[PDB]
Amino acid sequence: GSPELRQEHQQLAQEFQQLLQEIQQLGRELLKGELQGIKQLREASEKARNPEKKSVLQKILEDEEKHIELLETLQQTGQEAQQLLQELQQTGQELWQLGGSGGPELRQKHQQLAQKIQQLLQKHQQLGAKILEDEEKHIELLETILGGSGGDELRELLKGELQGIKQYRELQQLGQKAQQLVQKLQQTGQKLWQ
């Protein structure tokens, strides 16, 4: 348990804390965008005359209703990761300051917390990945019905879906980074608290 290994590990914990905060902020921005989208989608649907267009907007609406539930779950998984990370950093602060009473139980608790965050980040990544595949399909479907009666509202929809997909792709990239960081947090923690 070198001092350099302690510094690397605890720094990784702080990098991971900051990354999870940036992921959680992005998640809140995506939910705001989903809620705005579904307003503009429910309107344009009721404003659609062509059944070829009403059909497409209705399929998208059903997916957006599911996306709100999936995003609630995604954000909650992120919040749970943030709570366990607070508890992990606490456990490590105790391990560094204690001796004797404050040994195996706490060392195990540290590695248990790291493993649970690793599981939560996999759930969080999978939820985001499923929503993204849907948004790709929505851009393709909106592109097919572009131009006509409601072309103004359809334009404003496609534009929100294009800004939204960039944010979902960013969330998945940041999640890839977070998974790599928590793998390294776990492995350095094992080396320290073995």
Numbering used by the authors: 1 to 194
Question: What does the article say, verbatim?
Answer:
A complete understanding of cofactor binding requires consideration of the apo-state structure and its transition to the holo-state. The heme-bound and heme-free structures align with a Cα RMSD of 1.2 Å when inter-helical loops are not included in the alignment. The heme-free structure was obtained using a crystallization condition that included a large excess of CdCl2. Several Cd(II) ions are resolved in the structure, one of which effectively takes the place of the heme by coordinating the two A-site His residues as well as two water molecules. An additional water molecule in the A-site is hydrogen bonded to Gln111, and the side chains of Trp, Gln, and Leu residues adopt rotamers that would clash with the heme cofactor were it present. Only one of the two His-Thr pairs in the A-site forms a hydrogen bond in the heme-free structure, whereas both hydrogen bonds form when heme is present. These structural differences suggest that the cofactor binding site is only partially pre-organized prior to heme binding. Given that the a/d core of the RC maquette near the A-site includes two Gly, two His, and two Arg residues, all of which are likely to be strongly destabilizing in the apo-state, perhaps it is unsurprising that crystallization attempts without a stabilizing A-site ligand were unsuccessful. In the RC maquette, the high heme affinity and mostly folded but flexible apo-state indicate that the partial fold option has been applied successfully in a de novo-designed heme-binding protein.
Recently, we described the multi-step electron-transfer activity of a designed reaction center maquette protein (the RC maquette), which can assemble metal ions, tyrosine, a Zn tetrapyrrole, and heme into an electron-transport chain. The RC maquette integrates a Co or Fe porphyrin electron acceptor (A-site), a Zn porphyrin pigment (P-site), and an electron donating di-metal center and tyrosine (D-site) for photoactive charge separation. The RC maquette is composed of a cyt. b/b 6-like pigment/electron acceptor (P/A) module and a bacterioferritin-like electron donor (D) module. To fuse the electron donating di-metal/Tyr portion of the RC maquette to the pigment/electron acceptor domain, we joined the corresponding helices together to make an extended 7-nm long antiparallel four-helix bundle.
